[PDB]
Design an enzyme around this catalytic site. Structure first.
Site, PDB file in Angstrom:
ATOM      1  N   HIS A 110      -9.985  -3.881  20.328  1.00  0.00           N
ATOM      2  CA  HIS A 110      -9.713  -3.095  19.129  1.00  0.00           C
ATOM      3  C   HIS A 110     -10.999  -2.710  18.415  1.00  0.00           C
ATOM      4  O   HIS A 110     -11.061  -1.625  17.854  1.00  0.00           O
ATOM      5  CB  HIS A 110      -8.866  -3.898  18.138  1.00  0.00           C
ATOM      6  N   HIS A 113     -17.124  -6.702  11.710  1.00  0.00           N
ATOM      7  CA  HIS A 113     -16.819  -5.681  12.690  1.00  0.00           C
ATOM      8  C   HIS A 113     -16.846  -4.329  12.005  1.00  0.00           C
ATOM      9  O   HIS A 113     -17.001  -4.245  10.795  1.00  0.00           O
ATOM     10  CB  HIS A 113     -15.442  -5.918  13.290  1.00  0.00           C
ATOM     11  N   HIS A 117     -15.152  -0.078  12.078  1.00  0.00           N
ATOM     12  CA  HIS A 117     -14.206   0.958  12.502  1.00  0.00           C
ATOM     13  C   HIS A 117     -14.959   2.264  12.526  1.00  0.00           C
ATOM     14  O   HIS A 117     -15.809   2.487  11.659  1.00  0.00           O
ATOM     15  CB  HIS A 117     -13.045   1.068  11.533  1.00  0.00           C
TER      16      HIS A 117
HETATM   17  C1  LIG Z   1      -4.086 -13.569  10.931  1.00  0.00           C
HETATM   18  C2  LIG Z   1      -4.863 -12.507  11.426  1.00  0.00           C
HETATM   19  C3  LIG Z   1      -5.540 -11.636  11.912  1.00  0.00           C
HETATM   20  C4  LIG Z   1      -6.350 -10.564  12.530  1.00  0.00           C
HETATM   21 SE1  LIG Z   1      -8.191 -10.930  12.254  1.00  0.00          SE
HETATM   22  C5  LIG Z   1      -8.605  -9.438  11.120  1.00  0.00           C
HETATM   23  C6  LIG Z   1      -7.948  -8.226  11.215  1.00  0.00           C
HETATM   24  C7  LIG Z   1      -8.312  -7.183  10.397  1.00  0.00           C
HETATM   25  C8  LIG Z   1      -9.339  -7.339   9.487  1.00  0.00           C
HETATM   26  S1  LIG Z   1      -9.842  -6.040   8.418  1.00  0.00           S
HETATM   27  N1  LIG Z   1      -9.960  -4.701   9.390  1.00  0.00           N
HETATM   28  O1  LIG Z   1      -8.770  -5.876   7.447  1.00  0.00           O
HETATM   29  O2  LIG Z   1     -11.146  -6.404   7.911  1.00  0.00           O
HETATM   30  C9  LIG Z   1      -9.973  -8.572   9.392  1.00  0.00           C
HETATM   31  C10 LIG Z   1      -9.614  -9.610  10.207  1.00  0.00           C
HETATM   32 ZN   LIG Z   2     -11.724  -4.021   9.672  1.00  0.00          ZN
END
Ligand SMILES: CC#CC[Se]c1ccc(S(N)(=O)=O)cc1
Ligand SMILES: [Zn+2]
Ligand SMILES: CC#CC[Se]c1ccc(S(N)(=O)=O)cc1
Length: 259
Positions: free
Chosen positions: A63, A93, A95
């Protein structure tokens, strides 16, 4: 098993069928209307304390890619601002888009940036990340916009390891990386209560989105776009457009740290 993604057939418009909270009351990301956001004098100073951050590994999870940290102690923490208590950095991370005109999850007066960095932190009063995500104040995500211009020198070590984690499930050592090199000069921010922006879309995040973008070079972001969503030996699906669009603000106000 989980089969959500970002394509026409498993992308954000489908997520609600397996994750009904997708249509909830505090979903992220959102558009930040800069004229409606109000300065909040109750916000305490923001404290980004990454001096002792210990990076460990970089993972392509199919992802995005995560740079993971040792969060077994308070080595890198976020405090202050809207936050009560101590939030420990666990990973960052990004996007990003297929083109420079899209990629960010948050938007600013409907403007999309080329990418968005998420530094993910969990509230240490809940003991572990898994418990924290079950709480309305369990996480704090520091979001930083990326625009294309001059290179970001502190990003280059990330860019250069991406060739070694091209496909889903690949990881590489990634020790001694300093995430302070990814910040802009100013810590001016907007904040609002929201959610994870991927499944499971849990409504556990205090979002802190910096107003000042960082600049990265076109060559740097082009290398993000060579990653793959697929696993090794599978038909190539470039890891691009791994962003969720803005969601309804509902009964929320976005607060500004700056007058
Ligand atoms: C329980 C759980 C899980 C998935 Se880990 C995750 C997913 C999205 C973000 S985000 N894009 O909102 O920073 C941060 C961390
Ligand atoms: Zn994120
Ligand atoms: C590529 C593909 C496909 C079709 Se199968 C499928 C399974 C789960 C979801 S969800 N609700 O988790 O996004 C969407 C689609």
């Amino acid at each position: 098993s989980h089969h959500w993604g970002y394509g026409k057939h498993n992308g954000p418009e489908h997520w609600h069928k397996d994750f009904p909270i997708a249509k909830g009351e505090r979903q992220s990301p959102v558009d930040i209307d800069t004229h409606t956001a109000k300065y909040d004098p109750s916000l305490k100073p923001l404290s980004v304390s990454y001096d002792q951050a210990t990076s460990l590994r970089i993972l392509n999870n199919g992802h995005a890619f995560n740079v993971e940290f040792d969060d077994s102690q308070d080595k890198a923490v976020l405090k202050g601002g809207p936050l009560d208590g101590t939030y420990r950095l666990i990973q960052f991370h990004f996007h990003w888009g297929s083109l420079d005109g899209q990629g960010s999850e948050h938007t600013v007066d409907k403007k999309k940036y080329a990418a968005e960095l998420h530094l993910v932190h969990w509230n240490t009063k809940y003991g572990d990340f898994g418990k924290a995500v079950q709480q309305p104040d369990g996480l704090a995500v520091l979001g930083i916009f990326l625009k294309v211009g001059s290179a970001k020198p502190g990003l280059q070590k990330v860019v250069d390891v991406l060739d070694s984690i091209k496909t889903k499930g690949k990881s590489a050592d990634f020790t001694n990386f300093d995430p302070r090199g990814l910040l802009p000069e100013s810590l001016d921010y907007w904040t609002y209560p929201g959610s994870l922006t991927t499944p499971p879309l849990l409504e556990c995040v205090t979002w802190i989105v910096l107003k000042e973008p960082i600049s990265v070079s076109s060559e740097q972001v082009l290398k993000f776009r060579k990653l793959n969503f697929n696993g090794e030996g599978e038909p190539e699906e470039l890891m691009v457009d791994n962003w969720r669009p803005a969601q309804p603000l509902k009964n929320r106000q976005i607060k500004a740290s700056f007058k």
